[PDB]
Design a protein around this ligand. Structure first.
Ligand SMILES: Oc1c(Br)cc(Br)cc1Br
Ligand SMILES: Oc1c(Br)cc(Br)cc1Br
Ligand code: SF4
Ligand code: SF4
Ligand code: SF4
Ligand code: SF4
Lengths: 445, 419
């Protein structure tokens, strides 16, 4: 008989011994956030469909408008009618409600405050003194169970803990001056160093973002996207599950940081800022790095968003996991073949970056992310075809042979229906939601 | 569960029975806000705003290693953690309930929001609707509501009887730090205007505001069963922040479809009445809307809109007749707030709206138990048949947002059940 899927068993079977799994060499240096394709001047500008050169997201806007007027849900993809085209873009736009300028990357601005002191919730609760009272728990074992329970309340589908590896913290962040209002933010972005110093609390000066040397740990959350919507990549409904999950990321960071602060510790939110989420997720055991560059998880494949919170709270690091992703990516190459921009390499991993957008000195598949971003104005969305076609995104990959779990090798050989089809709360799927149930035994050992 | 809800559909028409005495209810009359109920003593005998006295009890319990009134925790650390989780849950909620209309998160226009400004070049909020068919719109908006975190969603025509006659709010330029000390009353009126608008004198809802969308936000069963202790407070608090995100997400979606949308959370009007008229559940002895999926262990929020929609049918699965003989909430209520008598049209005090047939409860007695216990009680929700220690909760089953995979299939949705 078919053995019922056991996600906790799978993670236990593939757990590794302690140690960062990312292989590095001597040319590794911390990476300035401005180098990402979203922000770097060499990649930031893209043509629109009339050949006008604009910030990439404005060119993409032009294409969304064109598609709605032409009754399309994506590039050369006709919608049922204009109203359906409109509805997909309204859903996408609404999804971003709790996210600043596509990713919340500015540290200690807007939702990403490094201290709780000025938040309305902190002010309302001030008479209890939870953020001023010294911790009543210092045991990392109990703290890990408490904070993971809170993380699940706060919307994480996956949660893991690692020691903080500063290699993946950006050398300089992209941010805005503290006196700049929102409406000018996109015109006034600057860089600011992230430094580690002997100070009691995270603090920002005119010159630096200062993380305490006591900031020992990073908590990484996975925020699951919706399978049916992502499978419409590169069309509008894939954009909408992406967007909603960014607002879920923001809520998660704020909720969890407040919990940690009210336990007597400090906490730094990040969403897409501060450091490289994929590396932290790999070191925290959520999954493995992949050819496409994302963290592939046993539960969701790469079809999951990541955020993270940095803290001095004592915690028990999780073990990394190796369920064979590297070996499957070595022979699969479906994302590379299906990529509309040919951004993903079909070659071997190297330590040598393809361009300014890659951090050299770590063994990975090196992809051309200027090519990827170039397809976003062309398609009017955030693509996601590589996530959509990856066999690990399928809900159906795990089989049990009577002794142990294994990956089914056979897996590697329209939008109207989405709007009319299955949905559940937050786009989660009840046919798989059991996979993320959690008891103390799987939160801390 | 889609089977059950169709089986128990009523014919159209509001199931709340009213008489000629009914009048719209001023929000200040709630026990949370009214001057006769607002001040309560703490355990030292000092009279304070009720929530400040409740704070004093939370501090006393943490110092004493307790998770609730005369409920010892495993240790002080566990006591601290439950209150830290509770406090954190409220992060996206202003002053317990987001009730001030058109302030903070509850803006009646999207024009100033950061998301609207970022998306302004696309012009979704200025473009006329491309869809006016109420059938397609009902399908679209319910799909969006599920993306936005509703576990249940229903649509009703807007019954103005349940809209507060006057809201509790603050002047628009008052900073948060002074909000609690500068609350005022402000009329909510309906006029022939194009868009929801606020003047110095009035909150103005357009006469075109035809519909209300009601969302159910499920609480966690294991945590609510710890009522009146701290983990029941935590699931309450997290769901309030889920309510706020739902309102903003859904209002933005409706605006980007070419319509207007008014968020509300605990403000603007009476959620239980809207939820009953929208078919989420039935009114009960304790006063809550009892749902088939969650019983009363579910929070409510609602959004008002001129978007054309198909109203859902009210549901009757026997709650009134069961509450007639049950009385379990009334017997377990630590404050004797819930009546054991029959339903009437006459409120027991200023806190009830007279003129509608309901079980009349003494809500000042309920609120009085909150500073005593240091929480939001919830014992009535916990003991209700329709709903079915703290160390075991922290060490036990949890899942994303506190939802339960053993029951999550009950809220799966296809177009057939959306419209
Ligand atoms: O990660 C993303 C960012 Br940052 C911006 C936009 Br637009 C889309 C995605 Br996906
Ligand atoms: O509904 C509630 C409000 Br409004 C305030 C507090 Br405190 C607790 C609850 Br439950
Ligand atoms: S599609 Fe294949 S090669 Fe690409 S990330 Fe997925 S498994 Fe790896
Ligand atoms: S998002 Fe699209 S363009 Fe970018 S790497 Fe993936 S498949 Fe290629
Ligand atoms: S919340 Fe508690 S005190 Fe209030 S009615 Fe329910 S059982 Fe009674
Ligand atoms: S406990 Fe019994 S009487 Fe009270 S609301 Fe529930 S079913 Fe009704």
């Amino acid at each position: 008989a078919e053995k019922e899927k056991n996600a906790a068993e799978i993670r236990q079977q593939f757990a590794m011994t302690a140690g960062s799994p990312i292989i590095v060499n001597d040319k590794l240096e911390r990476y300035a956030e401005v180098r990402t394709a979203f922000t770097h001047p060499t990649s930031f500008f893209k043509p629109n469909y009339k050949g006008e050169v604009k910030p990439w997201f404005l060119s993409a806007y032009d294409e969304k408008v064109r598609q709605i007027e032409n009754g399309e849900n994506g590039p050369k993809m006709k919608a049922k009618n204009v109203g359906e085209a409109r509805a997909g873009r309204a859903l996408e736009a609404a999804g971003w409600t709790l996210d600043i300028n596509y990713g919340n990357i500015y540290p200690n601005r807007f939702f990403m405050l490094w201290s709780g002191e000025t938040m309305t919730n902190t002010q309302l609760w001030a008479p209890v003194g939870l953020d001023r009272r010294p911790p009543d728990t210092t045991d990392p074992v109990e703290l890990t169970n408490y904070v993971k329970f809170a993380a699940r309340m706060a919307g994480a589908d996956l949660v893991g803990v690692a020691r903080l590896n500063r290699n993946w913290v950006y050398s300089e962040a992209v941010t805005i001056p503290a006196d700049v209002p929102y409406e000018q933010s996109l015109h006034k972005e600057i860089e600011k160093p992230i430094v580690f110093k002997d100070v009691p609390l995270p603090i920002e000066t005119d010159d630096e973002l200062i993380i305490p040397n006591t900031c020992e740990n990073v908590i990484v959350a996975g925020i699951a996207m919706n399978r049916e919507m992502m499978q419409t990549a590169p069309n509008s409904m894939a954009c909408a599950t992406t967007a909603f999950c960014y607002s879920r990321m923001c809520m998660f960071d704020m909720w969890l940081c407040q919990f940690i602060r009210y336990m007597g510790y400090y906490a730094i939110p990040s969403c897409n800022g501060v450091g490289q989420s994929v590396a932290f997720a790999v070191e925290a055991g959520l999954g493995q790095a992949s050819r496409m560059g994302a963290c592939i998880t046993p539960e969701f494949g790469p079809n999951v968003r990541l955020t993270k919170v940095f803290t001095n709270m004592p915690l028990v690091p999780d073990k990394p996991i190796d369920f064979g992703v590297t070996e499957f990516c070595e022979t699969c190459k479906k994302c590379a073949r299906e990529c509309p921009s040919k951004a993903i390499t079909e070659g071997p991993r190297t330590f040598e970056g393809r361009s300014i957008h890659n951090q050299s000195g770590k063994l990975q598949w090196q992809n051309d992310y200027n090519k990827c971003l170039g397809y976003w104005p062309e398609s009017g969305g955030y693509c996601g075809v590589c996530v959509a076609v990856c066999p690990f995104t399928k809900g159906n990959i795990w089989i049990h042979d009577g002794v142990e779990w294994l990956i089914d090798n056979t897996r590697f050989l329209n939008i109207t229906e989405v709007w009319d089809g299955k949905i559940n709360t937050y786009g989660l799927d009840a046919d798989h939601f059991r996979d993320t149930v959690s008891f103390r035994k799987d939160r801390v050992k």
